[PDB]
Amino acid sequence: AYKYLEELQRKKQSDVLRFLQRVRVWEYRQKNVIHRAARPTRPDKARRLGYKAKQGFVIYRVRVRRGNRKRPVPKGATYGKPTNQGVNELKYQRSLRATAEERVGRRAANLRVLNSYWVNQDSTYKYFEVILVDPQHKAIRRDARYNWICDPVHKHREARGLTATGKKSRGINKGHKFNNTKAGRRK
RNA sequence: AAACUUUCAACAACGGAUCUCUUGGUUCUCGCAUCGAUGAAGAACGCAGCGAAAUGCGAUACGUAAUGUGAAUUGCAGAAUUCCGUGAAUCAUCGAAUCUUUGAACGCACAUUGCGCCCCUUGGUAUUCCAGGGGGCAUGCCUGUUUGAGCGUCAUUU
After folding, report:
1. CA atoms A79, A72, A91, A115: torsion sign
2. Are A130 and A101 a contacting pair, CB within 8 Å?
3. A34 touches strand B (CB under 7 A)
4. What stretch of H or E contains A61?
5. Is the CB of A139 under 7 A from strand B?
6. C-alpha–C-alpha distance, residues A90 and A76, integer Å
7. According to CATH, what is the number of the domain A1-187?
8. Straight-line distance from CA A69 to C1' B48, in Å?
9. Cβ of residue A156 near strand B, that is under 7 Å?
10. Biological process (GO) annotations?
11. In whole angstroms, what is the distance from residue A140 CA to residue A55 CA?
């Protein structure tokens, strides 16, 4: 079964994928910033990423906000070149869904987060859904086929960068790049 | 001629330089992995027979316990009354304790020591009012437990 689902949600828009994404988003949208877990929306390629299984269960949902970069201030200003001068249209190196992963963390790091999956997109957001495993918990480290997440440092890192999209938005390359730095370098 | 004034003598005198001093500092190198909701870092306020502070400590207050050292004095011998062959204030001690009022600060507050609610036990003696000692009531999430919610929705003998 898992396979059908996977390669099924692989065809977006498309009759079902759409007439579904619509009801859902029309739902989801309305339910508090982040609105922690229910029972795992799309379980398909969720396993690809250590699915639901953690810890016993726990996968929360969050609506990040869409768009570009809110350059604060009102001004400039600061000379401008090399703007500086520029404001309205800086673009966020962050990683839209990344932000999601972080806030989710905050909204409760009684757990630690294994990875985050997309789900839908308005013109006023981007509906991402994150996973967990409650290390400070049960089988999590007991039936620990996975105590990885449990050990000392590998935790809360749901935003020290060492996550996945950050790992990606940085340097998981190898060759043709200056992407393990740090470095800087070189003095 | 002195006074005065300059000048150089010696003696004092202002001053604290030079010399030598070093329980600091400064930079080196080599081991080592530890804070806190089991209440941390920080803050007050206090605690010696005699103490202001630096220091240590918390109403068991320059200290309790426990060890070995000790073997003999500490706050070492400031004074002082001081007390000792049953082990004195010192080191180590963190296989014990005490750890006020606080601070991530926590029942609500907090320019105040102000204001509530439970539970246990004492006086007034009818539980329901007033006073005494003991124990307690933050938040976000995790997981189970335990009650109830909708025209989410299933099935039942009506």
Report:
1. positive
2. yes
3. no
4. strand A61-64
5. no
6. 13
7. 3.40.1120.10
8. 66
9. no
10. cytoplasmic translation
11. 5
Please provide the size of chain A in residues: 187
How far apart CA A66 and CA A161 sit, in angstroms, is 21
CA distance linking residue A107 with residue A104, whole number of Å: 5
* Contact in structure between A80 and A86 (CB atoms under 8 Å): yes
The technique by which this structure was obtained is X-ray
For strand B, give the nucleotides within 7 A of a protein CB: 140-144
**Cα A90 vs. chain centroid, distance in angstroms?**
21
Is A131 exposed, middle or buried (CB count within 10 Å of its CB: 0-12, 13-18, 19+)? buried
- Peptide bond between residue A177 and the one before it cis (omega within 30 degrees of 0): no
Resolution in A: 4.0
Bridge partners of residue A61, in order along the sequence: A129
Structure tokens at A150: 């449990």
What tokens does A41 get? 């929306």
What residue segments make up the domains of chain A, in order of their start? 1-187
Q: How many C-alpha atoms does A139 have within 13 Å on its Cβ side?
A: 7
